[PDB]
Every structure is written in C-alpha cells, then in structure tokens.
C-alpha cells in the first residue's frame, strides 16, 4: 500500500429518513442533500474534501517532475487540417502552449501564411463564407456551453455589428450569394429563466442576413409539440438545397427535410411573414435510421445510412421519385463504413474501420467503382473537409507515438501519392524505443475484444511493469489510439505499459457492437474491461496491485462499476466526471438525453438492470466476502468541478460520500488503507496540465512506481 501518512476523513452527515420506493424495492438516499450545489452544507463538504485531497497529494512527490515533463513534451508547433474557400486556404496553428489556436489564411497552396485572427488577447464554430470575404465564429461568454456568434471581414479583420445569442453546436452555413447563412439557435430567454439555469429546448432553424439584428432572422423550422427534438443542417455543394436533420436523443437516427432554394421567388425573404415553417419536402419523416447526404446531381441524392445495414452503406434516391431507393456502395459484411466524402468533381473517399484501424478507399461517384485502397497503420485518420469542387484532399494522422501529420493529395495533377504537408515532433523523445500492438482477448461470454498495448521494445513479461488501462464503452463511440503528451511521460519516465480496450457499447464493429453493450446488456461493457485487465495480468505485463484504470463521463461510470465488482484487480482508479447515480441521472440538466443507452428507473424492467450496477448503490466492503479477507478498494481519485452543467457534480460527490461511509468511517479499524479522495476543480492548457499532473502523481504513488530519468 503506497501511502503511509494516516488519513483524517471528514464528518459527512447522513439523512436516514430519505427513502424512495421503486416498484416495491426500498432504496435509501442519505446524501440526497449533496444534490444542491449552492447550500452551505454542500459548500463545506467541498471545502473538507479539498483539504483531505491536498494533504494526500502533498505526499505525492512526483507531481512536479510530471508537470514539467508534460509541459516540455507538449510544447511543439501544431498545424490543423487546411480547407479551401474561393482561392484562399485556411488553417489553425499553435506554437505549443498558446491557450488557443490562431487562425491563418494564405493565397495559394504554395502561398505564405498570414494571421487572420489571434484569440490570445474560448472560441469555436469557425466558418468562412463562399467568397472568402467573411468569417463567422463563436465566443464562449460563461461557465455554461452557450456561444455568441460574431462575424469578421477578412480584408481588414474588422467586426460586423451582428451578434447572435443562444447557439450551442451549430456552425454558419453560407448561401452562395454571400448574403447570409443558416444556423440553429435556441429561443431567447423567457420570464423566470436565467442565463445560468435555462434549459436547451424548442430549437429553431433560422436564416441570418448580414448587417442585421438577430430579431430580424427568418424562421424556417420549429416544433412546439416536440420540444426535445434537436437539429443539424447543411447546404449542398451546388448551393441549391438546404438540408435540415432532426434528431431525438442520443440515437444514430434522423429525419431529413429538403428545401429547394431555386424555387423560391425573392429568396429567403419570401418567409418574412413566418407562416411559421417553410415548405420542406419531408424525404424521411421517422427516427428509424441514420441518413447523411454525401452528394447530389440535381434531384438525385447520395446518402450514407444504417437502414438495414448495421455496418452502414451508400444509397441513392431521386427526390422526384422518393419510393425508389437503390444501393450504390453495398454494406460490407466485415467492416464499418465510418464516413464518406465527395471530392474532385466525380470521386468518393470512403473511410472504413477494419478491426479498429482505418482503411481509405477512393471510388468513382457515378458507378461506385473501386479505384484505389490504402490501409492505415495503428492510429487514426480524420478531418477530411474537402468539398466536391476541391481537387486537393488533406487529412490528419495521429497515433500513440505520432503527435500529428497532415497529409496532402492532389487528386487532379499528381494523384495516388500522399505527400507530408506538415509533421509535428515531440522534443527529446526517441519514438523508435517503443511500439504498439493489437491482441484480441476473450470476455466472460467468449466474445473477442480487441485491445491495443503500448510498451517499450524488448521488455520481459515478468509481471513487473506499472500498467494504465483506458476505455469508454457506450453511445456508439469509436475509441482510437491517438496522441497524448502525458501518456509519453508515463511510458518513458514511469516505465509504464499503456492499454486501450475497444469494449462493447462502442461503434467499432457497427450497431451490433453498440447494442451488445447498452440497456439490458450494459454489464457486458464492464465484463469486457475486467477481462482485458485479467489478460494483462496472466500474460505477464503486470500484476493486480500495479494496474491503474482511468476514464471520463460514461468512462467514469466504467471505472466506478469495475472497482465495485472487482476491487482486487486494480491498484489505482481515476474517474473523471462520471455518471454515478443511475437511478436519478435523467432528472438533472441534459441527462434525460442518455436514457436511450442506459434505460430509465421510471420503467420497471429498466430499473432492474440499473440497480445491479449503479455505482452509489453497489459499494460493498470486499473483505467481508468469505474468500477475500485481504482485499481492499484501490486508491481512488474522483475528478470533477464544483459546478458542471454537463454531468452534474452530485454524481461524484454522492459516490465519494458513499465510499468514505461504507469503507472508512462506518467502522472502527478499517482494513481500507488506500485513500479515497476527490480532486475538485473550482470553476485552458495550463489548467488541464495541472489536473493531469495530479492524477499521474497520485497514480505513481498508488502503484509504487518510481521515476526513471
């Protein structure tokens, strides 16, 4: 047990009268009062948990060495993927440690870059007009996610007066007349609501004319009967059709409404009246499948869909004859079609995920015929933003040992052969001393689970190495082995082995992989992660007390469920912003959007599966189980912010209180010696560095792993 300085756990009050009935099952909730973040008693708790946490971290002598290495390894120039508008190319750049990326512009491909906007004096949703004369961007005013959109002129970097409030994730979609754009804002604030405490409902699709106030924007769609339905939108590369996509919750499923802009007399000004919604052709009007438009030749559209294709495919339909849908690129029986991109007037780039590695195909657009195939090494290719009219395609490659390469491919003039456009370099790190491999590991039920393992070349499998394992396992999210500077520090200066596990609930083998780890089958996700740890131990990478596990949000749920079920297997656990009360999550902020993956304790069958793994309801003293008297919980750090509208911090607080009660303060001479603490952020690159240095310092101490120069 790494930690020797004894622990003074603070008193935490239990309300023994709070009890709820779930279909005849009585569940006590003695920390109900921790659900209010503003009360005197909750603020005292925060203060008491901060004092305990600081005292344990002061014993962790490698925090400072970690912090300086992270800073040094992350301090290198980085280029984003370039995109084209008119004859200008745009990209982001960071020298290394700038708090935000700087936005650059150049005249030709061989042109000299100039600074167009430097925020270093938070910013998302950058979108350049068709003629390259304007750009729209979002500023973050608060602690909440709300964004304000402003527009600049690229010629002199001057602002327009236009200010658009109440945007979240919707970028500006510009019409080809350069007069304005479509976007999807939430309504203005009403009586009784407050900027801090407003919900995000009743989303709208609007058109904004440049040089006007938000209150003049044309209303194209809203639905007051279905307040939770949310929106994304798009315009076709030819400029003729506005596409509106309507979604419900977390599912990979959407509606598709199409508006023919060429049929409107006097453009978007026709709707000045409201008459409240525009005359959309409602091509798809249910939530049965995912649809994303890839191209159109007049009224003939190509779409990517999961309709009777859990690995996805490309289909074609004529809007003038919408009963008839025809396969263009058939579903593969082994590989997921992750994305598709129309390029160079008549070509398609398809990005496949094949045993959790990318493969790129280049095809003919009209026929679907295969022209070239490029398998990619262990890592991830992403960010293809080229449009159909563009002849140069760019994308980014990243991996555990590759900080970032941007590749360039002139499909017109010098085709087939990827040239490096920019390559990032980690300073003072010899990449050739390390390697990454993939193995497939059997889960409890026999299913094979792919995991990646990164380690120093030529190590002995003698059980001696500290090991960190990461996973997520939900929502159809594909977990790729990308670059992290702090992970390099763990590998080099702690002698570590890193493992990424592609457990079920992800999307890696399509929709069947997602469904085998959601709702009634969520327990499969935990079993998959436990199996991976058992493999790392039996194959001789590490041992039980030298395994750390880490994850965030749904990944934090992952960590907490796994330590409740198999505490013997782990020496350290770090849960960042986890969903910990699975009976009550849907009651707070936007947690109601996660019922599609988790179920909801409102329905009796869904309760019965939730109660078995809910973290705050399954904390149990491992030493009281008759064969494992020598087991305790791993040293545990729960990470959160004291205020967080994404995953409310009551989740973390209630768990922390439950663990400290059950394992430490309910009994007189507890075998639990490993510390159970929270690292609480009150209220940016340097903030993030300090969080990660704390977590790795605590990890080194807990696993009794010394520093190596």
């Amino acid at each position: 047990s790494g930690f020797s300085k004894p622990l003074h756990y603070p008193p935490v009050r239990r309300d023994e009268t709070v009890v709820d009935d779930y279909f005849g099952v009585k569940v006590a909730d003695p920390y109900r009062w921790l659900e209010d973040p503003n009360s005197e008693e909750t603020k005292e708790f925060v203060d008491n948990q901060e004092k305990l946490a600081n005292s344990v971290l002061e014993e962790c002598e490698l925090i400072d060495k970690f912090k300086q290495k992270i800073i040094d390894f992350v301090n290198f120039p980085r280029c984003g993927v370039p995109f084209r508008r008119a004859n200008k190319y745009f990209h982001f750049y960071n020298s290394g440690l700038q708090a935000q990326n700087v936005f650059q512009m150049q005249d030709d491909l061989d042109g000299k870059p100039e600074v167009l906007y430097d925020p270093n004096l938070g910013l998302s949703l950058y979108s350049v007009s068709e003629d390259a004369k304007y750009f729209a961007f979002g500023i973050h005013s608060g602690l909440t996610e709300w964004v304000t959109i402003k527009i600049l002129k690229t010629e002199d970097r001057s602002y327009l007066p236009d200010t658009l409030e109440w945007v979240k994730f919707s970028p500006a979609i510009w019409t080809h007349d350069n007069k304005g754009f479509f976007y999807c804002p939430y309504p203005p604030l009403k009586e009784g609501e407050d900027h801090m405490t407003r919900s995000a409902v009743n989303q709208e699709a609007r058109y904004h004319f440049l040089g006007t106030d938000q209150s003049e924007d044309i209303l194209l769609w809203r639905d007051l009967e279905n307040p939770a339905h949310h929106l994304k939108c798009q315009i076709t590369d030819d400029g003729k059709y506005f596409l509106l996509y309507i979604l419900d919750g977390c599912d990979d499923a959407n509606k598709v409404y199409c508006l023919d802009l060429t049929k409107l007399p006097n453009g978007l000004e026709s709707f000045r009246g409201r008459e409240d919604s525009a005359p959309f052709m409602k091509l798809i009007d249910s939530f049965d499948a995912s649809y994303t438009a890839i191209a159109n030749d007049g009224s003939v559209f190509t779409f990517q869909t999961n309709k009777d294709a859990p690995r996805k495919k490309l289909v074609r339909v004529d809007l003038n004859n919408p009963s008839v849908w025809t396969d263009l690129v058939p579903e593969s029986k082994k590989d997921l079609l992750e994305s598709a991109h129309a390029v160079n007037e008549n070509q398609l780039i398809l990005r496949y995920l094949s045993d959790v590695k990318h493969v790129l195909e280049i095809r003919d657009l009209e026929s679907g015929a295969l022209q070239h195939r490029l398998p990619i090494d262990i890592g991830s290719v992403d960010g293809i933003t080229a449009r159909r009219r563009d002849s140069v395609v760019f994308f980014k490659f990243t991996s555990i040992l590759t900080p970032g390469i941007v590749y360039q491919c002139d499909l017109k003039n010098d085709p087939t052969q990827l040239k490096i456009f920019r390559e990032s370099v980690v300073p003072d790190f010899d990449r050739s001393e390390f390697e990454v491999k993939q193995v497939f590991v059997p889960s409890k039920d026999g299913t094979k689970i792919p995991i990646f393992i990164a380690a120093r070349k030529g190590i002995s499998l003698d059980g001696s190495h500290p090991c960190e394992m990461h996973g997520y396992g939900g929502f159809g999210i594909n977990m790729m082995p990308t670059f992290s500077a702090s992970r390099i520090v763990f590998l080099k200066h702690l002698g570590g082995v890193f493992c990424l596990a592609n457990i079920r609930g992800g999307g890696e083998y399509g929709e069947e992989w997602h469904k085998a780890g959601f709702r009634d089958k969520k327990q499969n996700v935990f079993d998959d992660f436990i199996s991976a740890a058992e493999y790392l131990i039996s194959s001789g990478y590490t041992k039980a007390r030298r395994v750390a596990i880490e994850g965030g949000a749904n990944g934090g749920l992952l960590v907490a469920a796994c330590i409740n079920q198999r505490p013997d297997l782990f020496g350290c656990a770090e849960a960042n912003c986890g969903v910990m009360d699975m009976l009550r999550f849907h009651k707070f902020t936007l947690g109601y959007l996660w019922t599609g993956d988790y179920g909801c304790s409102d329905k009796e069958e869904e309760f019965k599966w939730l109660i078995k793994y809910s973290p705050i309801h399954n904390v149990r003293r491992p030493w009281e189980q008759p064969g494992n008297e020598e087991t305790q919980y791993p040293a545990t750090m729960i990470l959160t912010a004291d205020h967080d509208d994404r995953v409310v911090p009551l989740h973390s607080f209630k768990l922390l209180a439950t663990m400290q009660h059950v394992l430490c303060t309910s009994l007189e001479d507890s075998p639990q010696k490993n510390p159970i603490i929270a690292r609480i952020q009150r209220k940016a690159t340097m903030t993030q560095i300090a969080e990660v240095a704390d977590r790795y310092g605590f990890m080194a101490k807990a696993l009794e792993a010394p520093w190596i120069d």
Binding site: R78, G80, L97, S124, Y126, T398, F483, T685, Q688
Partner: peptide, 7 residues
C-alpha cells in the same frame, strides 16, 4: 481542424 492541446 481546430484541436485542443494534446495533454
């Protein structure tokens, strides 16, 4: 495109 720092 506009990526946070890979900490």
């Amino acid at each position: 495109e506009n990526a946070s720092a890979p900490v």
